[PDB]
Amino acid sequence: LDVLNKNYNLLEHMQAMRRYLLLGQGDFIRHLMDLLKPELVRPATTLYQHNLTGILETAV
Amino acid sequence: PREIITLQLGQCGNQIGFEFWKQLCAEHGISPEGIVEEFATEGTDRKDVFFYQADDEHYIPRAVLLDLEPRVIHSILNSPYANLYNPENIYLSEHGGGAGNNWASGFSQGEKIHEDIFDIIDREADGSDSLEGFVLCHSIAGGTGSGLGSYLLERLNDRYPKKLVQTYSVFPNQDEMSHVVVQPYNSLLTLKRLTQNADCVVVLDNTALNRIATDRLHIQNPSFSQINQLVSTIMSASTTTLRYPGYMNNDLIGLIASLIPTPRLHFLMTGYTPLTTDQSVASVRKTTVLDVMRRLLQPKNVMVSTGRDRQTNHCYIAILNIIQGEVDPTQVHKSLQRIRERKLANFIPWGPASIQVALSRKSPYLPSAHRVSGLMMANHTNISSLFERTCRQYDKLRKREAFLEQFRKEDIFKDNFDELDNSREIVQQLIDEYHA
Amino acid sequence: PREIITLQLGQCGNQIGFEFWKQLCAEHGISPEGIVEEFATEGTDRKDVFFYQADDEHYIPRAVLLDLEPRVIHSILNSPYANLYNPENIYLSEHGGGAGNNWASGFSQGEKIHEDIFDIIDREADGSDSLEGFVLCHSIAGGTGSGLGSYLLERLNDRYPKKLVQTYSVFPNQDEMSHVVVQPYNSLLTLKRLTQNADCVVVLDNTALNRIATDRLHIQNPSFSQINQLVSTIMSASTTTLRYPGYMNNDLIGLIASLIPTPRLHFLMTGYTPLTTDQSVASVRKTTVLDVMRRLLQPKNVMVSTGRDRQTNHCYIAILNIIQGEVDPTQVHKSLQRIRERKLANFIPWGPASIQVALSRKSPYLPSAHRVSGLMMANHTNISSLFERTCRQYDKLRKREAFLEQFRKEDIFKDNFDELDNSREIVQQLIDEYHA
Amino acid sequence: FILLKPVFHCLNEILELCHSFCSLVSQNLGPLDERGAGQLDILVKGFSCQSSLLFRILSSVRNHQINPDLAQLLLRLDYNKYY
């Protein structure tokens, strides 16, 4: 349990996944879901993924 | 993102917002001229929601302060918290105003400085491409905050139509009528603009301030230096879901949406218990959350002068109970368990009610991470007693021939007095009709 | 190799090029009269691209400066940076000119000094056997830079046909029309030569200068000593791929080729954010590249007076975003990732668009190797608002009988006024037609 | 190297087809000649022989079990192409 704390932060990732998949802190997801709605109102195309990667990066 | 522009205005609205920004630096772990502590980012996870976003880690306040009286701003620059304020966002040095004491003064001064009043306050609007709204941190007492504040409730309704409007307005004092006598006139003129030209208000009574200021605070001569202590804490308490990282109703359009039943019914009762510093020596023994919300619905912490025997025919519709800091959340559902057994809130017989409880972690500070805090945002239909108090003091003054010849010389040609009287009775009749 | 001859001309064009050469010595690590630092070759890998190549490690500027007014050159020789300039390349001591204030003065003086004006400026042309081109560092304001500058745009088009022409021309000020009144006449006569007798321009508005000069610079009385500070940095910023060692678009015919859609559509919008010295104390904490290009497309750093509500029916076609110095290039593709999600640039519906980003290492200097710099070279089709502003001020003046009898006595026999009006409307119609 | 046979043959076919756009323009007053438009008509086919062959790799980039560094680069020019 000490080698993860020095190098990998294993159970810190247990808390970090709760903020995105369990949606613990809402400001990460609300500033997401505000910008994220003008893309979700249209049907998805093959041009969908490329602006979804940096609508994340302007949200984080 | 969620940037709100505060509109501090008037003789009393500038002083209650001065220590509101001064409260925010002590909890963010920041200094008004520098950054000496590292507690601002590890302890607090969000800071750019009321401040302007940083250029040198200097969180500029998104604030504007206009007043006709230069006395309120000359007691600011000698304080060491004024260097955080900017001398180019609002005014430079030696700013002035009118003479001046009239509701018709600031109502007529809005369209002669119309070019300058819509120039520098709009520069902060396009800083963020998703503006939250506007809060008018103004006053009802006097003619300074009530005269000019009624103008911006009209022209910002159509120029910025998709923005939230909601104000923390303070009510004036009705003890004697010697120093001021124009109090029934300028109050009802702004109160009409607070219902149809404004969505929500947060009422703050003055006669209920000295009820609390002699309750536990133990003063003999009531001064104006105590009016900023009860007000600045509950202002920062109302944004604990918004400033500190919360999940549900973490926006200002989140909290107000879950409490307003209908337009022109938005007057929210406020409550806040912990104001005593010698409680600190006995909170070390795990003082729980099971006893802090039993006294919120009990009419002891209220800031609204209302009748004590008028609560049996009135019914609560929406009640907010905000706990902060250390909550011990394994018993917060246990505190809400005990609500249905007492029925301390009368429930509306036509529809459901709601007791909403929420939590957020407080500042990394020793008086904040130790003592439980309870903020109440009630909505009870006994608020017409204040509207019956203001209207009975309004029609009695017009039969005494008071300020009918001294008030209609400037910019008033027709009788707009019953235009305020019927619309106030429309509020008072639809409140009692709302529980069928 | 890639030698460019700058054509500094006029009352304003000589002063903006004087500190342009003065900026180049502070970043090359050289002195105008000697070489005291060894940072010129180990830090900077290329120096002979704007300077003349060395004979004694004295990098002579490849510059010529002609003006009718002797006042601009008499404020040069007392400065210690004039010994780098040569008194035989342009003029010796006591050079003069006209009287003189007219567009027809310098237009008629070009063919009476025709032998001398094409003698000493051609001696620098055959120094390198592969000449890059000519940049006319001239002015539009006044009759000095606009009168003589229109002549060299014609006779250098055929005598040197295979050379790049592109100018950094400054636009005049349109606030009041009391000191000068000949401003609509001399501007449109040069603006016709800037589209058909010239390939590209770089517009620099004067009414947008004092928008920035009071934004963050905090001045009370606007003087002419601030006009050289915003201009000389972006001139040296535009040649960072050309002076400092870059790879792609490292020539002046590299940058301009990737932005011009078509001839007579070449007016490029410029933007440059970092101009404040107290930002330096907070750039020590790894200020990234992810936040510096979010504000370039946001209309805050622009130097073009354009409409704010006219950007919805106009579309960007080419946008340049130049980062300099410390870039941290592992996140420069991360900055371009966030561009498609906002769509802050409206894209043309007929063809593709392009957001080009490039980098080059800056000077080995402490204010240069620490703070991020962003240079913008936009191309947006809302530039007809300036052309609608100049044309509406042009036809209104001809109906007031202004300068129709006072202007046609010398060397003007026919009405060439509608020759400028239709060709300006040809530009304004083909811009809106360009997005089908 | 992006792919062994097709993309390297697609890429050298790009640089050959715009190399005859050099030698077509390089005549005296190119676009007014009959040979200027006659040599052009083969090239307006071969240029869309290259964008459509670039279009054929993008379907192999979306339907993806091949290579991530291939896919991240070729789409980076492709939203820089189709946007």
TrEMBL record, chain D:
<comment type="similarity">
    <text>Belongs to the TUBGCP family.</text>
</comment>
<protein>
    <recommendedName>
        <fullName>Gamma-tubulin complex component</fullName>
    </recommendedName>
</protein>
<comment type="subunit">
    <text>Component of the gamma-tubulin ring complex (gTuRC) consisting of TUBGCP2, TUBGCP3, TUBGCP4, TUBGCP5 and TUBGCP6 and gamma-tubulin TUBG1 or TUBG2. TUBGCP2, TUBGCP3, TUBGCP4, TUBGCP5 and TUBGCP6 assemble in a 5:5:2:1:1 stoichiometry; each is associated with a gamma-tubulin, thereby arranging 14 gamma-tubulins in a helical manner. Gamma-tubulin at the first position is blocked by TUBGCP3 at the last position, allowing 13 protafilaments to grow into a microtubule.</text>
</comment>
<comment type="function">
    <text>Component of the gamma-tubulin ring complex (gTuRC) which mediates microtubule nucleation. The gTuRC regulates the minus-end nucleation of alpha-beta tubulin heterodimers that grow into microtubule protafilaments, a critical step in centrosome duplication and spindle formation.</text>
</comment>
